[PDB]
Amino acid sequence: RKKVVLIGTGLIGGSLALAIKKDHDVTITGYDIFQEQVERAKELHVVDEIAVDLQHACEEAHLIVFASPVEETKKLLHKLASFHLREDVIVTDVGSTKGSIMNEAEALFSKEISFIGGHPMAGSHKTGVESAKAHLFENAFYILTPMHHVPNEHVEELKDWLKGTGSHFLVLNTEEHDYVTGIVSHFPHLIAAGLVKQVEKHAGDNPLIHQLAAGGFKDITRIASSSPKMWSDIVKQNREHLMVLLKEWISEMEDLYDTVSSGDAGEIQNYFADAKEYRDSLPVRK
Amino acid sequence: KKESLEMRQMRKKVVLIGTGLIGGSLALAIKKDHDVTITGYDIFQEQVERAKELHVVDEIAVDLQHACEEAHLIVFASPVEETKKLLHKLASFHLREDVIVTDVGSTKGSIMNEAEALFSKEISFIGGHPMAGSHKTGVESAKAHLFENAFYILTPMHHVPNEHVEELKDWLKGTGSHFLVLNTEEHDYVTGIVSHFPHLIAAGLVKQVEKHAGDNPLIHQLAAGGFKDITRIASSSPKMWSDIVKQNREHLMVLLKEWISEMEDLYDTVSSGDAGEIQNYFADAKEYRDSLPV
Ligand SMILES: NC(=O)c1ccc[n+]([C@@H]2O[C@H](COP(=O)([O-])OP(=O)(O)OC[C@H]3O[C@@H](n4cnc5c(N)ncnc54)[C@H](O)[C@@H]3O)[C@@H](O)[C@H]2O)c1
Numbered sequence: 111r112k113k114v115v116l117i118g119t120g121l122i123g124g125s126l127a128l129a130i131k132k133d134h135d136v137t138i139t140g141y142d143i144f145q146e147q148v149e150r151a152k153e154l155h156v157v158d159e160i161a162v163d164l165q166h167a168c169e170e171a172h173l174i175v176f177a178s179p180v181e182e183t184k185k186l187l188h189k190l191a192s193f194h195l196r197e198d199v200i201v202t203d204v205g206s207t208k209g210s211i212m213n214e215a216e217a218l219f220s221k222e223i224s225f226i227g228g229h230p231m232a233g234s235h236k237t238g239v240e241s242a243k244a245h246l247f248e249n250a251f252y253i254l255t256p257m258h259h260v261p262n263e264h265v266e267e268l269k270d271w272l273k274g275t276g277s278h279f280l281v282l283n284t285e286e287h288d289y290v291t292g293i294v295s296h297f298p299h300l301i302a303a304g305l306v307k308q309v310e311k312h313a314g315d316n317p318l319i320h321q322l323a324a325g326g327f328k329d330i331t332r333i334a335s336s337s338p339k340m341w342s343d344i345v346k347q348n349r350e351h352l353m354v355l356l357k358e359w360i361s362e363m364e365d366l367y368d369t370v371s372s373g374d375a376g377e378i379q380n381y382f383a384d385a386k387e388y389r390d391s392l393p394v395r396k
Numbered sequence: 397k398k399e400s401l402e403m404r405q406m407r408k409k410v411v412l413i414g415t416g417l418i419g420g421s422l423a424l425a426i427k428k429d430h431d432v433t434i435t436g437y438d439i440f441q442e443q444v445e446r447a448k449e450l451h452v453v454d455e456i457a458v459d460l461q462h463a464c465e466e467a468h469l470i471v472f473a474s475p476v477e478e479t480k481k482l483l484h485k486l487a488s489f490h491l492r493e494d495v496i497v498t499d500v501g502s503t504k505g506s507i508m509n510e511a512e513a514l515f516s517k518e519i520s521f522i523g524g525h526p527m528a529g530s531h532k533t534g535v536e537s538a539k540a541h542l543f544e545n546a547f548y549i550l551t552p553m554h555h556v557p558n559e560h561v562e563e564l565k566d567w568l569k570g571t572g573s574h575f576l577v578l579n580t581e582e583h584d585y586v587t588g589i590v591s592h593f594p595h596l597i598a599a600g601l602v603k604q605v606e607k608h609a610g611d612n613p614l615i616h617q618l619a620a621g622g623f624k625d626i627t628r629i630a631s632s633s634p635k636m637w638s639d640i641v642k643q644n645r646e647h648l649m650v651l652l653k654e655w656i657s658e659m660e661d662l663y664d665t666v667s668s669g670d671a672g673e674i675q676n677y678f679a680d681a682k683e684y685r686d687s688l689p690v
């Protein structure tokens with residue numbers, strides 16, 4: 111049976127490992143700098159083996175998956191370039207940004223290795239391999255950003271490796287990926303955190319706010335409970351897009367202030383009607 | 397004559413003005429714990445007819461006056477600007493001396509000022525705000541349990557004695573809500589911060605994304621959990637939210653100026669490129685959100 115290496119045996123890694131095993135009879139060897147995490151992954155039948163030697167495992171693998179944070183993936187690509195991999199190997203990652211990863215891949219592996227950037231656009235904030243599920247990516251978009259030299263059949267192969275995910279796969283270039291995910295994922299995380307911060311500022315002075323924020327406000331700001339480390343890293347890696355979006359946003363807020371100041375019931379109703387038309391225009395998932 | 401008889405001959409009467417999500421839900425909660433006749437009135441005939449089909453109301457009111465004049469409890473579940481307008485018509489009617497009148501408006505200041513101007517010392521008007529609901533509209537989506545374990549704010553008029561507030565709590569015990577008596581200024585201040593201002597930001601977030609979606613259709617398609625969860629409330633009734641912004645305009649203007657200053661500070665933090673300061677921003681948000689009770 112074919113061999114898979116999973117580097118980073120956490121929520122997203124474990125989830126992908128389970129989705130592969132669901133639709134494919136394969137040996138998944140796990141590697142993590144956190145021994146307890148990969149040991150637990152083995153206990154839970156998310157991986158079949160723990161890698162002593164990262165080199166031996168990678169050199170025999172048909173598929174290598176990086177589910178490590180993007181800075182750790184970037185560092186480990188340099189090690190992967192020093193190894194003698196199979197000629198047919200497919201290498202992928204799960205990073206929320208693709209710019210840095212694909213630049214590093216182009217510098218190290220051009221023409222030799224099939225590296226395809228990945229971004230499964232779904233996740234529980236519930237963490238660890240403990241919380242990994244085969245169906246975590248069901249009906250979610252999964253972005254693939256192939257290197258320049260990668261032929262189409264290798265992208266279709268990777269889609270087949272990951273068909274167990276139940277995801278809608280979409281090929282984007284790096285620039286498209288970081289632009290759209292900056293607007294639809296990264297920027298909303300910034301606003302959610304800011305919304306929680308503004309409410310906390312008032313909660314200090316009135317404890318009823320703390321009691322009432324536990325209802326509707328807590329539910330809509332769920333993403334603000336995501337890993338601060340992970341999201342600091344994402345903001346750093348998509349900083350230029352997010353800076354341009356924040357200046358747009360401040361200008362949008364100055365226009366909304368002018369609308370509310372005007373006191374025009376019709377203009378205020380138009381504002382909400384326009385937002386409602388767009389929000390209702392998004393398709394229902396699963 | 398009813399003074400010769402110790403026992404009630406006919407069950408008590410409730411009027412529901414506005415037979416929609418919140419109105420229907422409250423009607424169902426009242427009927428759960430009380431044997432009463434609920435008569436429905438709505439400017440939308442289809443809505444009140446459907447409310448009657450679904451056994452949310454027992455009767456449809458032809459005449460708003462006749463219905464109100466025989467009612468023990470009158471509930472306004474109309475949008476807040478429509479409630480405010482309807483109070484002057486209620487003041488022209490000859491209601492029962494024991495009547496309790498309440499609303500479920502998301503804002504209370506404008507409504508209670510109108511009530512004080514019309515009914516002082518005569519009518520027991522108690523403002524209401526159930527702190528539970530949905531972006532979904534219509535009696536079709538109404539549920540008896542919608543307010544279970546949610547706060548329900550009451551803003552009694554200055555003259556209303558405690559026993560009438562306790563009566564209204566008993567009328568609405570079926571809600572399973574935690575009832576809380578607030579003044580109008582406290583209510584509109586806290587709901588402005590926790591509910592009204594977030595609705596403005598959700599709509600703004602949708603508007604900013606739409607500006608880019610025009611030029612790149614993938615933005616529309618790739619919108620996921622992060623975007624969809626925080627913007628769900630932008631699907632709420634524009635009429636309802638235009639009314640709320642009008643009735644809490646001065647607080648929302650002050651909160652928007654704070655917000656713009658907060659966003660200017662966040663821009664300086666992201667511009668600095670300091671991973672620690674950016675991490676502190678998210679860590680502070682996470683520690684507060686995790687500190688809210690469950
Ligand atoms: N969590 C999400 O919502 C989400 C969604 C899509 C993509 N992603 C991407 O997936 C990555 C992982 O997310 P997660 O939720 O699985 O995080 P996680 O912490 O649950 O798992 C990441 C794992 O990588 C391991 N790791 C760290 N450095 C490593 C190294 N040098 N070698 C090997 N393993 C290493 C960690 O020990 C951990 O087990 C994120 O950094 C992000 O880029 C996350």
Ligand SMILES: NC(=O)c1ccc[n+]([C@@H]2O[C@H](COP(=O)([O-])OP(=O)(O)OC[C@H]3O[C@@H](n4cnc5c(N)ncnc54)[C@H](O)[C@@H]3O)[C@@H](O)[C@H]2O)c1
Pocket residue numbers: 413414415416417418419437438439440443473474475476478479500501502503525526527528529530531532533534535633636
């Ligand atoms: N939706 C929520 O989450 C929520 C929560 C708490 C309070 N509220 C408040 O409840 C009230 C109604 O909200 P909803 O969610 O039930 O809305 P809705 O649109 O589902 O129902 C309101 C109903 O009132 C009717 N109506 C409008 N103007 C009227 C008028 N002049 N006379 C009679 N009927 C009229 C509408 O036709 C509709 O059936 C609003 O004041 C709103 O602020 C809403």
